Design a protein around this nucleic acid. Structure first.
Ligand SMILES: CC(C)(COP(=O)(O)O)[C@@H](O)C(=O)NCCC(=O)NCCS
Ligand SMILES: [Mg+2]
Ligand SMILES: [Mg+2]
Lengths: 242, 111, 115, 217, 69
RNA sequence: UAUCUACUUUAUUCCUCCCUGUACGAAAGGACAAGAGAAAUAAGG
């Protein structure tokens, strides 16, 4: 289907490769995480009626992992589906208009430069930490400690989402996404990359390929690497502010 | 456009009391044109400041940044910087004590 | 970072700076919410029993990359109305004064050099 | 062969593909701009566009006193004193507002990092701004300039006397007592030179990187 | 006591010949500023300072540190 | 030297600028809102 105003599409699951700088045409650094898409695929579509949620859902998984190390219900699942098993399966809330058949590859060019994006991953676990590192500090008549009191305990190793991150550059060959700033998680961690929910960015799905990007469509194929307009590409002449 | 010719138009059209500009060479990477202009009083310098930012703002150059008048509260000095040029509205006594016309011609050859 | 109590190397042709004195000029207040001043902030300054506003021109802790880093806390005096006390500034001044919001155009007419 | 330090990764459990990508961009910049061989003693002059002037450029000259940073974001900080004032700038080698990096005087000092020049005499840190690039011959090793500098009095930036720094370009004999020397030999760590699990061998790394260099040609 | 005799008045008249080639500014305040650079300075000075001020007169003539327009 | 109870991952603000030196006033005066900025704090990385 074509894009309708108010529809949601699929996200991705990507490795966090690491960071590198990226200079814009105004001569400002932007630290950029690389996110490689490794063997991302759609695993199961559940409509809203069977979900009993508000919206339909796509289950999508990334990074092929050994068949010798999974529960047999999972191996039956992937056997019937016809795929090697992915490490993580994340679930996307999605409208009926975007529903790719289960078993289809998702690529890096599902996103395009200029698009803003939200990324969720487990934060780097710091193990048991005390109050000064965890919360950053250090009644009588109340004879008890309130719930949600800030005390020592296990820091990190929790899901956190960085909201509204600009996509600067995508590399179609190696399937890298180059996203602004910092993403939760260590290197080589799997992140869930969806389009941003921020209400300043809720209508710019006009130019994005709506079900997903299909190289199989063979229509006006993409270069090595899409750049955002403001990115100083490597190989461009050295920029002058005249 | 808003060139130094247009600045001469704005200041002689205002009848600025005293004019002296220096073409700053491109190495000394501050500006190109360094305008030194005096007036009658604080009302005069103030009003001709709001006049020249009025004419630059109203004139052209939307993509170019809006320009803030510096030193609105001080009496003797006033200064406004553009892309190519920077104007200094001051008093000729203030000019006598800060001797800017010597400096931007004698970069290491003065006191 | 030029906080309270920091010794300050005044770079001016001013009477207050180049006058000899038994106390080094040191900061008293920094005009930000946190008390940490960077290149292009105003501070109060104690020179010869006289508090005086001042403008930070380069410090010793590193900033962003392509900007310079000095081996002293160079500071230019200024008056309350905003025009500087000085007449010449000998030590080089970073061009990073140009972008910041505040009184900088007055000082950049005075510099011998620019770094 | 000279392979510039920014291509050699620090060891770590990151993925080699990320350095494949970085090296690809680094060589694509090295097409446009010529990045020369230079060490941590050499005198450089760098022309940069200014974000504050309208397309005017500038030149800074000094000593490269550190070559820190790996990958595309790698820097070098050069020092000079002018107007009786010490200045240093961290230059990013691949920031596209640099136009040329000319090597005035290619020379290697005794150390790998000359940060002690902040505490030397200012004559060891001053240079001519308009100094002429000295001509080197094409087929020769580099002149290793040794110059044990003279130090200003004791409250230094860091305790350069300590043997964790391994500073060679000091005339310590002029500016330190024998008692404080023997005190500084307390923090020796003599074993540290002899363990074989701390030694990061960049040899096969160099091989794959030189095939990255040749394959980009 | 200056660098020579003829050089001082030569640079003087040369600055005036640029003084008529001046284009944008108030040329009489310019000429009066040439006076105040030359009248109150070049009267009763030591023979060393004569050299330095005629050298800043040289540089002010050449205008490689900027030129008055 | 912790036995018991309780508990141990529930975005604001300042300044600048613009709109605008318009609205409103009749002169003095002089907006909002929304926008761009730069800061700072807190929260999360
Ligand atoms: C040299 C002279 C006597 C010639 O004047 P004229 O009356 O002979 C007179 O012009 C003079 O004193 N010039 C000095 C030039 C000079 O030294 N200028 C810099 C002032 S420190
Ligand atoms: Mg109770
Ligand atoms: Mg220290």
């Amino acid at each position: 289907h074509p894009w309708e105003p108010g529809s949601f599409r699929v996200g991705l699951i990507a490795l966090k490769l690491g960071m590198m700088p990226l200079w814009t045409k105004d001569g400002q650094k932007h630290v950029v995480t690389l996110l490689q898409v490794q063997d991302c695929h759609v695993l199961k579509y559940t409509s809203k009626e069977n979900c009993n949620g508000k919206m339909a859902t796509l289950s999508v998984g990334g990074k092929t992992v050994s068949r010798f190390r999974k529960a047999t219900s999972i191996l039956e699942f992937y056997r019937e589906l016809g795929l090697p098993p992915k490490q993580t399966v994340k679930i996307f809330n999605i409208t009926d208009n975007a529903a790719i058949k289960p078993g289809t590859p998702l690529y890096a060019a599902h996103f395009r430069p200029g698009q803003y994006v939200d990324v969720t991953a487990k934060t780097i676990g710091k193990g048991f930490q005390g109050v000064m590192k965890r919360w950053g500090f250090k009644t009588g008549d109340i004879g008890r400690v309130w719930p949600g009191t800030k005390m020592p305990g296990k820091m990190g190793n929790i899901y956190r989402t960085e909201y509204g991150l600009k996509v600067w550059r995508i590399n179609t060959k190696h399937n890298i996404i180059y996203v602004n700033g910092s993403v939760p998680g260590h290197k080589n961690c799997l992140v869930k990359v969806k389009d941003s929910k921020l209400p300043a960015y809720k209508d710019l799905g006009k130019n994005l390929p709506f079900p997903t990007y299909f190289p199989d469509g063979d229509e006006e194929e993409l270069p090595e690497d899409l750049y955002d307009e403001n990115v100083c590409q490597p190989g461009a002449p050295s920029i002058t502010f005249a | 456009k808003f060139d130094i010719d247009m600045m001469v138009s704005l200041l002689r059209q205002e009848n600025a009391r005293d004019i002296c500009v220096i073409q700053v060479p491109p190495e000394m990477r501050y500006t190109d044109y360094f305008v030194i202009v005096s007036g009658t009083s604080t009302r005069h310098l103030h009003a001709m400041a709001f006049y020249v930012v009025k004419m630059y703002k109203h004139l052209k150059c939307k993509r170019d940044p809006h320009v803030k008048i510096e030193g609105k509260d001080t009496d003797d000095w006033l200064c406004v910087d553009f892309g190519s040029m920077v104007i200094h509205l001051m008093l000729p006594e203030t000019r006598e004590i800060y001797e800017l016309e010597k400096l931007w011609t004698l970069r290491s050859y003065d006191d | 970072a030029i906080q309270k109590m920091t010794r300050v190397r005044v770079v001016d042709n001013s009477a207050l700076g180049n006058s000899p004195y038994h106390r080094a000029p040191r900061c008293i207040h920094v005009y930000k919410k946190n008390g940490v001043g960077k290149v292009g902030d105003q501070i109060l300054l104690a020179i010869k029993g006289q508090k005086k506003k001042a403008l930070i021109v380069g410090h010793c802790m590193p900033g962003p990359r392509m900007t310079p880093r000095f081996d002293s806390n160079n500071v230019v005096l200024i008056e309350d109305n905003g025009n500087p006390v000085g007449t010449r500034i000998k030590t080089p001044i970073p061009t990073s004064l140009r972008k910041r919001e505040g009184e900088y155009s007055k000082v950049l007419a005075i510099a011998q050099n620019f770094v | 062969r000279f392979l510039s330090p920014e291509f050699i990764p620090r060891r770590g459990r990151t993925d080699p593909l990320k350095f494949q990508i970085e090296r690809k961009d680094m060589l694509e910049r090295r097409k446009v701009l010529h990045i020369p061989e230079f060490y941590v003693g050499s005198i450089l002059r760098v022309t940069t566009a200014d974000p504050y002037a309208s397309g005017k450029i500038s030149q800074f000259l000094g000593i490269c006193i550190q070559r820190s940073g790996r990958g595309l974001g790698a820097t070098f900080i050069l020092r000079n004193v002018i107007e009786g004032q010490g200045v240093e700038i961290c230059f990013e080698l691949y920031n596209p507002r640099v136009q040329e990096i000319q090597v005035v005087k290619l020379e290697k000092r005794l150390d790998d990092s000359l940060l002690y020049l902040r505490d030397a005499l200012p004559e060891y840190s001053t240079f001519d701004v308009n100094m002429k690039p000295v001509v080197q011959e094409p087929n020769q090793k580099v002149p290793v300039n040794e110059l044990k500098v003279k130090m200003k009095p004791k409250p230094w930036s860091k305790r350069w006397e300590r043997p964790n720094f391994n500073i060679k370009g000091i005339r310590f004999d002029l500016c330190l007592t024998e008692q404080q020397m023997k005190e500084a030999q307390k923090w020796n760590q003599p074993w540290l030179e002899f363990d074989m699990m701390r030694e990061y061998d960049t040899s096969k790394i160099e091989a794959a990187i030189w095939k990255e260099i040749e394959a980009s040609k | 006591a200056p660098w020579s005799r003829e050089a001082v008045l030569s640079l003087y008249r040369a600055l005036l010949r640029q003084g008529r080639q001046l284009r944008y500014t108030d040329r009489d305040f310019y000429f009066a500023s040439i006076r105040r650079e030359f009248r109150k300075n070049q009267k009763l000075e030591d023979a060393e300072a004569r050299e330095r001020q005629l050298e800043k007169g040289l540089v002010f003539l050449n205008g490689k540190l900027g030129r008055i327009i």
